[PDB]
Structure 1
Amino acid sequence: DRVLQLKLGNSAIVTQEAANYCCAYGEWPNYLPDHEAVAIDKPTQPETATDRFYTLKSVKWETGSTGWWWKLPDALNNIGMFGQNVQHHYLYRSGFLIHVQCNATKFHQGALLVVAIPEHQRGAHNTNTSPGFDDIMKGEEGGTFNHPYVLDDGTSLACATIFPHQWINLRTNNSATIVLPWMNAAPMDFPLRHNQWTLAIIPVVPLGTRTTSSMVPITVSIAPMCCEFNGLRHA
C-alpha cells in the first residue's frame, strides 16, 4: 500500500513510502461530453506532450519559513507544449495531478499541510486598495504567505481541511499526491486571466534536529491530464 508508481506520457514517478492518493470530491478527470459542449469548432486534443509531469523549481525549507503557494493554470503558461497551446488558443479545459516531495532522515521532525483551494480570492492587509496584476500572476515561482494563520484572506486555517488535502509527516511518509478535476461554472475558460485552483503548502510543525545543519528542499510536479483547446489565434 505504501509503494506506488504513476506514468503519464513519457514520464514516470516512483516512490516507496507514501500514503494513498486522494481524488478531489470523488471525481476523475474526463473529456467534455456532447450534451455539455458549447463551442462548435473541433477541439485540439494533443494527448501527448501536454500530459506529462512538469517539475517546478525547488524551495528551501528553513526554521523561519512560513508557507508557499502557486496558481495552477498560471504556473504552466511558459513550459513546454502546454505553454505553446495556451498562447495560440483561446479556450482550454483540463484537470491536473499534484505530487509533492520532501524527505529527511530518521532524526528530523515536522509536518506539512498540502491543500488545494478553488477560487482563492486573496486579500491585502490593512489597506483598501485591491491587489493588482503585480503581487498575483507570478509564473513558475510562488509568493510566500505573509499571514498564513488566516490564509491571507481572513478565513481561518483551522478549517482548511474542508478542501482536498493530504499531510506530509516526516515520521511516517515523504510524499503527497492529489488528483483534481475540472471545476468551473463554464465548460471552458480563458487561461490568461482566470486561475481555477491554488496549490498551497504550509509548515504547521516546524522542523528540528540536533544532528547537523543541512538543506532540505521541497519539490512540486504538476501533470495536466485530459486537456483540450479551442479557438485558434496568432499569439
Structure 2
Amino acid sequence: RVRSITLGNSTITTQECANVVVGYGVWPEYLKTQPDVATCRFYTLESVQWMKNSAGWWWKLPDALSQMGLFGQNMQYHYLGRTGYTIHVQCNASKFHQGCLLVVCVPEAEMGCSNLNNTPEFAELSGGDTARMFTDTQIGETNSKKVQTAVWNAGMGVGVGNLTIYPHQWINLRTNNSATIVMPYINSVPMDNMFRHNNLTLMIIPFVPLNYSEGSSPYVPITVTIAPMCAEYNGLRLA
C-alpha cells in the first residue's frame, strides 16, 4: 500500500508499511521564541547517482537547506534558531540490482583535515544542497584544507562499522529501498546560530557495492527529502 503525505504545498508518496527510526526515542518538540509553520514543507534535494565505484555521500543539515525557500530566508533573517528534522531517503532500483546502504544521521560530526596542522574549509566541509562524496582512497597530506574523506574512517577517525551507534537505517536492495529517520533537536544550548554550526550530518555509505548485470541500468538514484520539524527562532520586537 502507498501512503501520500502532504506538507504545505508539497506532497510525497511512501510505502504505507515503511519503518521509521526515531532518533533517540524523542520526537521533535518546541522549546518548553517565534515559530514558523510555512517552513513545514518537504525539501527534495537533487538526487545522486549510486554507482559501482561510489564511496558515499554526506550533507550537513542546517547548511543543506540554506538555499531553500523560507527556511533559508529565516536562516539569514533570524540570528538564532532551533529545529528538528524528518529525513526520507529513497532508492529507485529494480529487483535485478543488488547493494546495501547505511543511512545514518550523526550529531556534531566534526571532521578532520588531510593536513594534520590545519582544519577543513567551509567549502570542503559542506556543499549546501550539493552532496559531499567520501573517497575510497586516502587524501594526501600535501593538500592543505581538505577533509580526510577515507570512507573506512568516515572522516572522524573512527571505525565506519561502528556508525550504527548513531540513529541509522539499513537499505538492503533485495529487502527494502527507503529509510526514514526522525531526528530531534540535539545541542548543548537551547538555541544556536544556524549559519556557523551544523548540528547534524546525514551520511549514506554503501557497505555492499552496487552490482548488476550488463543491460540493467548502470546507476541507482538516491533521493533525499528533508522536512524541518518544530522550527522556531528568536523574536525581533521590543518588550
Q: Same-fold call, TM > 0.5? A: yes
TM-score for both structures, normalised by structure 2: 0.87
| Equivalent residue, structure 2, for 1:66 | 55
**1:115 partnered with 2:104:** yes
| Equivalent position to 2:172, from 161, 169, 172 | 169
Is contact 1:17-1:174 (8 Å) kept?
A: no
Task: Tell whether the 8 Å contact from 1:18 to 1:173 is kept in structure 2 after alignment.
Answer: no
How far apart in 2 are the matches of 1:208 and 1:137? 29
For 1:120-139, list aligned pairs within 5 A.
120-125=109-114, 127-139=116-128
Name whichever of 15-24 and 51-60 sits farther off. Answer: 15-24
Aligned residue in 2 for 1:154: 157
Range with bigger deviation, 162-171 or 120-129: 120-129
Q: Does 1:9 align with 2:8?
A: yes
CA distance in structure 1 between the aligned counterparts of 2:187 and 2:16, rounded to whole angstroms? 34
Q: 5+ unaligned residues in a row in structure 1: which ranges? A: 34-42
SS of corresponding position for 2:207: strand
User: Where in structure 2 are there 5+ consecutive unaligned residues?
Assistant: 135-148
SS at match of 2:234: strand
Aligned equivalent of 1:44: 34
Per the TM alignment, residue 125 of structure 1 is displaced from its structure 2 partner at its CA by 2.9
1:129-180 Cα deviation digits (max 9, x unpaired): 2212331232111211131111112100121111000011110111000101
Q: How many residues align?
A: 222
Shift of 1:3: 5.0
Measured after TM superposition, the shift of residue 231 of structure 1 is: 4.6
Partner of 1:225: 229
After superposing the two structures, state which structure 1 stretch, 109-118 or 223-232, moved more.
223-232
Tell me, what secondary structure is at the counterpart of 1:158? helix
1:98–1:177 Cα contact (<8 Å) kept: yes
Partner of 2:143: none
Which segments of structure 1 move beyond 4 Å, counting only runs of 4 or more?
2-5
Identity of aligned residues (%): 57
Q: Secondary structure at the match of 1:152?
A: coil
**What SS class does the counterpart of residue 133 from structure 2 fall into?**
coil
Instruction: Give the equivalent residue in structure 2 for 1:25.
Output: 24
Q: Aligned Cα RMSD in Å? A: 1.8
Question: 1:55 pairs with 44, 66, 74, which one?
Answer: 44
